[PDB]
Amino acid sequence: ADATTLTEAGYVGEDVENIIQKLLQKCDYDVQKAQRGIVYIDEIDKISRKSDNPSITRDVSGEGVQQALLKLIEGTVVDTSKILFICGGAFAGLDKVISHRVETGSGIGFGATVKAKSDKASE
Amino acid sequence: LPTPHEIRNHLDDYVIGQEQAKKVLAVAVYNHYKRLRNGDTSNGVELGKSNILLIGPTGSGKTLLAETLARLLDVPFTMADATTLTEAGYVGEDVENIIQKLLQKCDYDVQKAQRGIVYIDEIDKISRKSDNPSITRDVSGEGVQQALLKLIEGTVAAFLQVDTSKILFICGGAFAGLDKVISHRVETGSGIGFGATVKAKSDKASEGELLAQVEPEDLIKFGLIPEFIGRLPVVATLNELSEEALIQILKEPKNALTKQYQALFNLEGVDLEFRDEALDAIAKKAMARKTGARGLRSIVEAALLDTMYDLPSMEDVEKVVIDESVIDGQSEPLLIYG
Amino acid sequence: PTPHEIRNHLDDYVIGQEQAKKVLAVAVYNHYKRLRNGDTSNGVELGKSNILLIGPTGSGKTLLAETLARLLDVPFTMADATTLTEAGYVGEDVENIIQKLLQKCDYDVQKAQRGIVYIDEIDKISRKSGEGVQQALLKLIEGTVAAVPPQGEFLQVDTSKILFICGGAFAGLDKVISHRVETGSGIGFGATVKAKSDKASEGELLAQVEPEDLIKFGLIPEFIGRLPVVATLNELSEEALIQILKEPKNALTKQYQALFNLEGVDLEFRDEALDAIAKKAMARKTGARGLRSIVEAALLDTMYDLPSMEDVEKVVIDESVIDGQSEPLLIYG
Amino acid sequence: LVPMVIEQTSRGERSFDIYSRLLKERVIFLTGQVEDHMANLIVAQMLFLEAENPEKDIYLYINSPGGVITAGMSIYDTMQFIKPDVSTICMGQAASMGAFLLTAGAKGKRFCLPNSRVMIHQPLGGYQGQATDIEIHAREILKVKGRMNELMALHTGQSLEQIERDTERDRFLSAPEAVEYGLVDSILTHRN
Ligand SMILES: Nc1ncnc2c1ncn2[C@@H]1O[C@H](COP(=O)(O)OP(=O)(O)OP(O)(O)=S)[C@@H](O)[C@H]1O
Ligand SMILES: Nc1ncnc2c1ncn2[C@@H]1O[C@H](COP(=O)(O)OP(=O)(O)OP(O)(O)=S)[C@@H](O)[C@H]1O
Ligand SMILES: [Mg+2]
């Protein structure tokens, strides 16, 4: 499935429930065979909440998508409490956050930590 | 038919600490009945429709006032929440069904239903809001307010056509956030020199006084359409229950929560009594929560939470005594074995 | 009805504003007389004449449009510009209000063409968004078929035959006008300082208003051009409020007195009491709007006890009663 | 040069200086010899803080050898007039008018640094002219000396006679000695 096409419940567009619907098409609409199936999601990082801007409006395409996924991912109610879930996505910009933590070094004075791009940790 | 004094005496039997609210509502409702009794209105001047608006803090008892007045009156009285009301042609509950609800309660007596009264609760919930992040079509919002205005002004619509011109209309709902606009307009700046009046933040006018002084511009800014405000000349403003009123509502009412817990323990053969020095302490704590009468139940539940957790397990229990210290957490509730 | 007849009827419900009544009456008569000539035998087309109302808050600008509309059977609606009305993120388009006017006329577009849609607080959108509302409102003020499609099939009515009246309580407009025609400085020994509690000459100064003044206030030239007819309203003095208590047909005193007459008890307000209520009303700055609230509260105590009290013939309210020193005197009988 | 700091708020970035930033937190500075110009500036800051919040405490760091006695009296009156309690903390040194203002703070809120020093001495003046004029000025300075001694005894709690004897000449007292004398209450060594 595609995470970008997903959206929060109560709004136009494919919702989280549609993820299970697609699985049914692949399992010839069999409940017994659906409980033993596996699902995969791509572009999961695209539904990440915009932490930079404080949440002021319902993010149907962002935070809302993750909130709905909290139930069916671990099992809810068709029951999805016995099917493995795999999420994948090319997280863009995550390396910047990690560097700001492990490095924890910057400044202008003598005691600061300044290093050339070559010595800086790669992505 | 009932004089303003009669309605006030019978109304206070249930509601407490709102003498001013019942006085204004009693005068407005009484005047409307006079016009209905003699609709000829020979006087040249046509008195405006007397529509009372119930606005106050949460937990004050606005819905309680509507139910109490229904018992005194014999005309049909139906309650509808604006949350379910929506525009016509959608899955949501249509607003045109409110008038129908008044006819069914009267046993399809259309002739006698023209003198009924209908109350609306949670009016502020349908305040017009920007439809920017809203769904494709804003089914709920300004549409409901405009549709209601059609009946408030007085129109014939359907069954048998019913005229709503003489049907008394009462509004309700607790306007959450309206105190911000009211306080902004009334509040004035403070000087800085020695001969200036400086008021501390703690010593600020209580919400009760702010609601006592309201202007139409405040309601329009809140979301209500300007025409709706004009249709409600009478505005019965309530005030948060005071500490003295909380204690009275804690014992005098027949269904007081204090007696509710006493009967609850009677199932296992145990009874408890609340000391006078403890009743006032519970009232002050509830006022701090700013939750109205609803806060009284929560406070007593937490204080007696430990009592109900181990009382049934224990044996040879006769009575339980609770004082101010027990509720305050200083000591555990007293219990005498027998 | 001719303009003279319109003036005679409107002055009964509303008092004062003699100049505003002459210009307003002629404007409505000229617009409606053109609409009635739907045939339009002459090849010359008839254009609408929008009206503009300028005056201090509480002067009765809204009451002039509503009261005048009641004289006719045509529907009248009102809108507020403080919400940035527009078909988009700017706000809520007034087009919905236009449909409301259509609903009042049994949902008949033919009769809706005679609307008197009025927009209040127009001065609040003055350019310093603010200018965006004015630009989007230029076409709406004039003829434009585009509008919210009605749901009674989707139609598209034009806003050319519906009269548009824009009026707002302009703040500071009297200062720019004074700096244009009137001379003298505002600061200094020789400056002509205007007393806040005396010399209420704002109404007279507003009469000498020209399109140039509105340009500096913030209104774009296009908006001013849309409103050719201009009217002014003078502030109601302390004595003016006193007349509003008795002279108007549906005055506050007449309404309350009639209500008490139902039970056989007649209340009379003396001239001394009327002036007492007017003086305190001016301090509150609420204008005529607060007159009904203050008067009702003063007689609320006795009104509640009036039906219960027996052996009552006629009550009376004294000046001291308004101040709270005593209570309305009752004549037993 | 005065460094310019930036405060992060919901509205957006705001520009302020080092002194202005601390002023927003109800903090005042008293640096340099006391005079009419600087004294008036301090009084204005106290009035502004009172209007914003007449309950929050207003801090005032005293660090100066002293100055004009008349100018200092204005600050003392403002501290005792505004409802908010003025907390005075001695930094570096507080002598002459500085010492008087240090003990003028609200009781139980006077502090001083461990290495701070406070010096107290009698009023200093002087006039030249005719004999009659010299007599008038001599009486004026004497009256000011008595009033200052009475105020000092009111805060420190010492006897009036004790204050007069100790004010006959300059007296240097370290931070530990200030607490015992009554000028201050405690000493702020480290943050806890
Ligand atoms: N004035 C009062 N006198 C006695 N009991 C009261 C009073 N006000 C509230 N109560 C009690 O509180 C209970 C629930 O309060 P409500 O009347 O529902 O408050 P509310 O104003 O309706 O809350 P809303 O609608 O969410 S703003 C009632 O059933 C009463 O038992
Ligand atoms: N000349 C008048 N004669 C009688 N009543 C008047 C008169 N002027 C004002 N009033 C009363 O005062 C009320 C308020 O005056 P308005 O000017 O109509 O208010 P308003 O125009 O809505 O104010 P704004 O522009 O929205 S802030 C009216 O509804 C009338 O009841
Ligand atoms: Mg208006």
From TrEMBL, chain A:
An annotated GO cellular component: HslUV protease complex
Keywords associated with the record: ATP-binding, Chaperone, Hydrolase, Metal-binding, Nucleotide-binding, Protease, Zinc
Keyword Protein biosynthesis assigned: no
Entry annotated with the keyword Zinc: yes
GO MF, one example: zinc ion binding
BP GO terms, sorted: cell division; proteolysis involved in protein catabolic process
Function as written in the Swiss-Prot or TrEMBL entry: ATP-dependent specificity component of the Clp protease. It directs the protease to specific substrates. Can perform chaperone functions in the absence of ClpP.
Protein family: Belongs to the ClpX chaperone family.
Subunit structure: Component of the ClpX-ClpP complex. Forms a hexameric ring that, in the presence of ATP, binds to fourteen ClpP subunits assembled into a disk-like structure with a central cavity, resembling the structure of eukaryotic proteasomes.
Entry protein name: ATP-dependent Clp protease ATP-binding subunit ClpX
Origin species: Escherichia coli
Encoding gene (name): clpX
